[PDB]
Amino acid sequence: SLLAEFPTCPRDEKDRPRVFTAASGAWLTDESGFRWIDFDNARGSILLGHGDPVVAEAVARAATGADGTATGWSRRVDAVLERLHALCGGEVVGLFRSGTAAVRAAVLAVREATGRPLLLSAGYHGYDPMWYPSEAPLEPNADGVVDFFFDLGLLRELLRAPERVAAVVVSPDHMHLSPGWYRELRRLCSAAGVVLVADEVKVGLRYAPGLSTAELLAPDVWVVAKGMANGHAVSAVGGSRRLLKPLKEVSFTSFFEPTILAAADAALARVATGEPQRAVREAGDRFLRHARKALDDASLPVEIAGDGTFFQFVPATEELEEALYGAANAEGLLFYAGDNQGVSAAFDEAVLGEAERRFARVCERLAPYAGGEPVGDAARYRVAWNVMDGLRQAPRDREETTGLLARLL
Amino acid sequence: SLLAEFPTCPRDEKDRPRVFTAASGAWLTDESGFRWIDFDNARGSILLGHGDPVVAEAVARAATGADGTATGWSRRVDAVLERLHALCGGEVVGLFRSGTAAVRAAVLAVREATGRPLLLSAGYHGYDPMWYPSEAPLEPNADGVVDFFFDLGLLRELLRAPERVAAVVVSPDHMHLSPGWYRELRRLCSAAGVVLVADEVKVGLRYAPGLSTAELLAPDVWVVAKGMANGHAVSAVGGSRRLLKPLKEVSFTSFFEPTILAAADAALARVATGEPQRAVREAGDRFLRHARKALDDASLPVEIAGDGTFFQFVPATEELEEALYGAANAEGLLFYAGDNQGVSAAFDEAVLGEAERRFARVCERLAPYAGGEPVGDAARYRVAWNVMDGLRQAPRDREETTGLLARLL
Ligand SMILES: Cc1ncc(COP(=O)(O)O)c(CNC[C@H]2O[C@H](O[C@H]3[C@@H](O)[C@H](O[C@@H]4[C@@H](O)[C@H](N)C[C@H](N)[C@H]4O[C@H]4O[C@H](CN)[C@@H](O)[C@H](O)[C@H]4N)O[C@@H]3CO)[C@H](N)[C@@H](O)[C@@H]2O)c1O
Ligand SMILES: Cc1ncc(COP(=O)(O)O)c(CNC[C@H]2O[C@H](O[C@H]3[C@@H](O)[C@H](O[C@@H]4[C@@H](O)[C@H](N)C[C@H](N)[C@H]4O[C@H]4O[C@H](CN)[C@@H](O)[C@H](O)[C@H]4N)O[C@@H]3CO)[C@H](N)[C@@H](O)[C@@H]2O)c1O
Ligand SMILES: [Cl-]
Ligand SMILES: [Cl-]
């Protein structure tokens, strides 16, 4: 309890952080010697696998000073910038030290460039107080942000006075929003004359070499991070020269640190091939097939949203959800509790076989829950809110919307 | 110009970033093969030396998976937190990904905890737009910050309604402010009952194992960064549980990235001994003794402020300033232009001997400037503003103070 922060991490039944000593590909070792298969993967930022040898080699060599210095420019700066520009498009690119920092800088730049005060937001954008909730729904917070919770009806309401709106800023979820949802969001923004920022810190580079919403949203400004460096401390923003001109004022001391550049250059090279993304989808799909069959065979009322790139357990009750993760912990399957599971490209045959076996045992442990009432919508909404910080897409009217917000805020 | 940002770095006569392809110790190699002795050292964040072997081996181990995982807690988290707490004091500690992020989080936490609106600031606190200049000098900016430019007369007036003030936040400079100045700041903050935040991102851990202002200011909250990881992308905040309770809300995806943790634990272990800070002070003092003697023997009107830990050339004219850095550049002495020079612990007997030879040659190249009018106060004020973003300490009244603000802002 020296730590002033509350980091999101794997925690035990007493809410104490699990202490991990080492990791390799899909596997972790804890301080008790217990061995785990990782579906958390630093919240999906470990796309390639823990201790990736090719990234590791690049990082080790950069640490010796052999690839340039934190004092100033190296050609790896140009490499990283060019790689991102090719994958994501736009006219310019900037680099940052976290997803939180990049999305804040992006949106403040757009607010400066447009001269308009309000940001309309769906999803999570990082830890900064600028994103804290307002006094009431549909009211701006103290930093001019209004949350629309992915409800396009609420967005239309807010877009009635678009002259106030610097940008719509959206964190995609491809488990809970359809392609059609995105095209409608795009349409609404375009017709309102408002800038669209795609916060792809989580989903960027993971579904494909580039932005997951490149065509669906064709955002004016993008942000990525988790996909770009196999976990290392870098994020990126890009888009029009005009909207991002205010980023000229960004400078920070560690900008040229060569280990982070080494990791991003290495990881981005593999990302560009599309191979790790395919591997993840395929491995995760294989795991899902099996897990869905095990749950059904055991009469357990747990749906799975999403797909192999990112999936989420949707249990019929809170009690079962807790039991599910307790059983998974007991069997050494480390899931990101309540949230999305994101396998890495290190999920090979060997790993998948073991994970399949362990999950069968998870389902045995849950035998007491067999035959429970099937999953209903309240559960779907609750569980989706945990991953997206807003409302999954499904038919509603305004009164149902209000009630869901009143419940879930 | 893919890059949307304008990073601070060594730049050539066309303002293009210098490309450095390698580094070891005190030495850089540029793209053309030229070897430079580095006094910039990533703005003083390279306290140990480029490619420090022990840091680099630690980073190499951590890159392989064998020393923690990005998915969660590791023993290095504890080690880093404990070491910071021992060196800097306070009740709790938080980690962040840049000095910019750390200072913003710290001052926002105090504002939240105190419930008071205004932050009274002196010095640079990073790139975030919360520190942008107010439209009217000495009035609050859009984020509630009033810059007082290190003038304690102005601070007195701003403290006349202390109930409005969340914190005074100050970036120390030990070249341009005396101990007595710090003691007066502490006395003023204490009499107003206001919280004092020491932004030691640059100076922390570099003058001593701990805070440069530990006794002088006895700050309620501290921030450090440049001293803690030999360049790697981490910073820290610490202070009272109360004031920093709002940091519970901080979480970021790369928190457990093992290479940065291993670098911090290694660098901090060295810092705790006091040895690198002593080496730096002694090596720098030896270089200054020599440079001062060379400038004087050449009748060049250049003073040097500061000491071995951080020093700054103060030329009599802007023309001579530009010539001085042109000359240094030609001799492969890489100074942080206009700002403070911070040698590293890798400045050994051989480096120093070669630096002295090169600097003597610099003075030879500046021969046309011999006999020039000696440095005056307008030059001292202009040059100090470049390094501290406010006013060097000297006797003034309010006429002279406001005159200087109008000139230098
Ligand atoms: C699109 C996007 N944009 C920007 C960023 C920021 O990038 P970064 O700075 O590099 O981390 C991210 C970073 N992503 C990390 C995670 O962000 C969310 O997770 C958030 C949030 O959803 C989740 O919120 C929790 C909520 O799900 C639970 N129902 C209730 C819990 N109290 C609450 O916890 C969080 O909010 C509390 C507010 N009081 C706070 O006290 C908690 O400590 C805080 N963790 O906590 C996470 C932050 O730590 C996503 N669910 C996840 O898929 C994702 O992996 C991102 O996904
Ligand atoms: C106490 C403290 N607190 C927090 C931080 C932030 O930590 P970080 O996020 O890890 O970098 C730092 C980081 N420190 C970096 C530097 O901060 C200052 O440097 C600033 C500022 O003084 C300096 O300002 C320049 C000024 O000295 C020149 N006379 C004029 C020039 N236009 C101006 O340029 C900079 O600020 C402009 C202000 N709008 C901006 O437009 C320019 O693009 C920017 N380069 O630019 C630097 C930004 O990188 C100090 N002089 C230096 O000793 C120090 O190394 C810190 O020292
Ligand atoms: Cl003063
Ligand atoms: Cl001058």
The DSSP line for B329-369 is: HHHTEE--TTS-B---TT--HHHHHHHHHHHHHHHHHTGGG
In whole angstroms, what is the distance from residue B261 CA to residue B76 CA?
6
Confirm whether A61 is domain-assigned.
yes
Instruction: Give Cβ neighbours of residue B162 (< 8 Å, ≥ 6 apart).
Output: B192, B193, B194
Residues A145, A265 share a domain: yes
Pocket test residue of A8, A40, A147 for ligand 1, highest count of atoms within 8 A of CB: A8
- The neighbouring-strand residues paired with B147 are B121
- Please tell me the distance between residue B369's alpha carbon and the centre of ligand 1 in angstroms: 60
Indicate whether A222 and A304 sit together in one domain. no
In a domain, B168, yes or no: yes
Least Cα separation, residue A338 to chain B (angstroms): 16
Residue A299 lies in a domain: yes
DSSP count for chain A of H helices, then E strands: 12, 13
Number of domains in chain B: 2
The minimal CB distance from A100 to the residues B81, B232, B252 is found for B252
A35 touches chain B (CB under 8 A): no
How many other CB atoms are there within 10 angstroms of residue B146's CB atom? 20
Q: If DSSP codes are grouped into helix, strand and coil, which group holds residue A21?
A: strand
- The helix/strand/coil state of B92 is strand
Question: In angstroms, what separates the C-alpha of A374 from chain B's closest C-alpha?
Answer: 32
- What is d(CA A174, CA B313) in angstroms, rounded to the nearest whole number? 57
Taking only residues 305 to 344 of chain B, the set having a beta carbon closer than 8 angstroms to any beta carbon of chain A reads 334
Does one domain contain both B287 and B315?
yes
Same domain, B222 and B287: no
Phi then psi for residue B302, to 5 deg, are: -130, 120
In angstroms, the CA A273 to CA A261 distance is 19
> Relative to the CA of B226, which ligand 2 atom is closest?
10
Sorted by sequence, the CB contacts under 8 Å of residue B127 that are 6+ apart come out as A249, A250, A251, A252, B100
Instruction: For residues A350 and A355, give the distance between their C-alpha atoms in angstroms, rounded to a whole number.
Output: 9
Identify the helix (H) or strand (E) that includes residue B191: helix B179-192
Closest partner CB to A254 (pick from B56, B98, B129) = B98
Please give the Cα distance from A256 to A248 (Å, whole number). 16
Q: Which atom of ligand 1 is nearest to the CA of A172?
A: 1
Tell how strand B35-38 and strand A35-38 pair up. Answer: unpaired
Residue A196 belongs to a domain? yes
Structure tokens at B405: 């603000």
Ligand 1 atom having least distance to the Cα of A101: 9
Kindly state the tokens that stand for B207. Answer: 């003058």
Looking at the fold, whether A89 and A219 belong to one and the same domain comes out as: yes
How far is it, in rounded angstroms, from Cα B172 to Cα B211? 10
Query: What is the DSSP annotation of B134-189?
Result: PSSTTS--TTSEEE-TT-HHHHHHHTSSGGGEEEEEE---TTTS-HHHHHHHHHHH
Per the DSSP assignment, residues forming a β-bridge with A198 are A170, A222
d(CA B199, CA B184): 17
CA angle centred on A187, ends A186 and A192, rounded to 5°: 100
Listed residues B255, B273, B291: the one ending a domain? B273
Beta strands B165-170 and B20-24 are unpaired
Same domain, A126 and A157: yes
Domain holding B86, by residue range, is 54-273
- Nearest one of B86, B43, B52, B83 to B261, comparing CA atoms: B83
To test the contact with chain A by mutation, choose from B1, B254, B340 the residue with the greatest count of A C-beta atoms within 10 A, namely: B254
DSSP state of A197: E
- Identify whether residues B148 and B237 lie together within a single domain: yes
Contact residues on chain A for B238, CB-CB shorter than 8 A = 4
Are A194 and A340 contained in the same domain?
no
Distance CA A73, CA A95 (A): 13
Kindly give, in sequence order, each residue whose CB lies less than 8 Å from that of residue A191, ignoring residues fewer than 6 positions away.
none
- H or E segment to which residue B44 belongs: helix B41-44
For a substitution probing ligand 1, which of A5, A171, A202, A340 has the most ligand atoms within 8 Å of its CB? A202
For the residues of A213-264, what is the DSSP string, one character each? TTTTT--SEEEE-TTSSTT-S-EEEEE-TTTTGGGGG---TTTT-HHHHHHH
Q: Determine contact, residues B201/B224, Cβ cutoff 8 Å.
A: yes
Query: Which amino acid, B271?
Result: V
How many CB atoms lie under 10 A from the CB of residue B217?
Answer: 22
What gap in Å lies between CA A156 and CA A153, rounded to an integer? 5
| Eight-state DSSP code of residue B246 | G
| Assigned domain for B211 exists | yes
| Residue among B145, B230, B271, B372 nearest A63 (CA) | B230
Q: Do B113 and B183 share a domain, yes or no?
A: yes
Residue A220, in any domain of the structure: yes
- Residue A210 DSSP one-character state: S
All residues of chain A having their beta carbon less than 8 Å from the beta carbon of residue B42 are: 69-71, 253-254, 256-257
- Contacting residues for B136 by C-beta, under 8 A, at least 6 apart: none
Q: Whose CA is nearest to atom 4 of ligand 2?
A: B125
Question: Residue A384 maps to which CATH number?
Answer: 3.90.1150.10
Q: For chain B, what is the radius of gyration of the CA atoms?
A: 21
Is A13 in contact with B257 (CB distance < 8 Å)?
A: no
Q: A256, B75: Cβ pair inside 8 Å?
A: no
**Residue A50 DSSP SS3:** strand
Q: Which residue of A has its CA nearest to B22?
A: A68
Of B6, B23, B249, nearest to A248 by CB-CB distance is B6
Q: Rounded to an integer, what distance in angstroms lies between the CA atom of residue A68 and that of residue A383?
A: 46
Q: Check CB contact under 8 Å for A68 and B237.
A: no
Type and span of the H or E element at A41: helix A41-44
- Asked if residue A1 is part of any domain, the answer here is no
* Structural contact between residues A219 and A213, judged by C-beta atoms closer than 8 angstroms: yes
CATH number at residue A77: 3.40.640.10
In-domain check, residue B405: no
What DSSP designation does A162 have? Answer: G
Residue B101 CA: which ligand is closest? 2
User: From residue A187, how far is each of A150, A169, A192, A292, B196 by CA, in Å?
Assistant: 15, 14, 9, 36, 50
A155 vs A123: CA distance, rounded Å: 13
Contact B237, B244 (CB under 8 A): yes
Residues of B in contact with A261 (CB under 8 A): none
Residues A294 and A253 in one domain: no
Three-state secondary structure call for residue A11: strand
Tell me if B196 sits within 8 A of B222, measured CB to CB: no
Q: How many CB atoms lie within 10 A of CB B349?
A: 9
The answer on A320 and A267 residing in a single domain is no
Closest Cα to atom 13 of ligand 2: B126
CB-based contacts of B394: which residues, under 8 Å, 6+ apart?
Answer: B377, B380
Nearest-CA distance A355 → chain B (Å)? 18
By the CB criterion, residues less than 5 angstroms from ion ligand 4 are B 379, 382
CB nearest to B69's CB, from A23, A68, A129: A23
Residues B48 and B68 in one domain: no
How many other C-beta atoms are found inside a 10 Å radius of the C-beta of residue B127? 25
- Give the Å distances, CA to CA, from B391 to A95, B186, B199, B202, B408: 32, 18, 17, 18, 9
Last residue of a domain, one of B250, B273, B296: B273
Considering B213, B238, B273, which residue would you say is the last residue of a domain?
B273
Helix, strand, coil fractions of chain B, as percent rounded to 5? 40, 15, 40
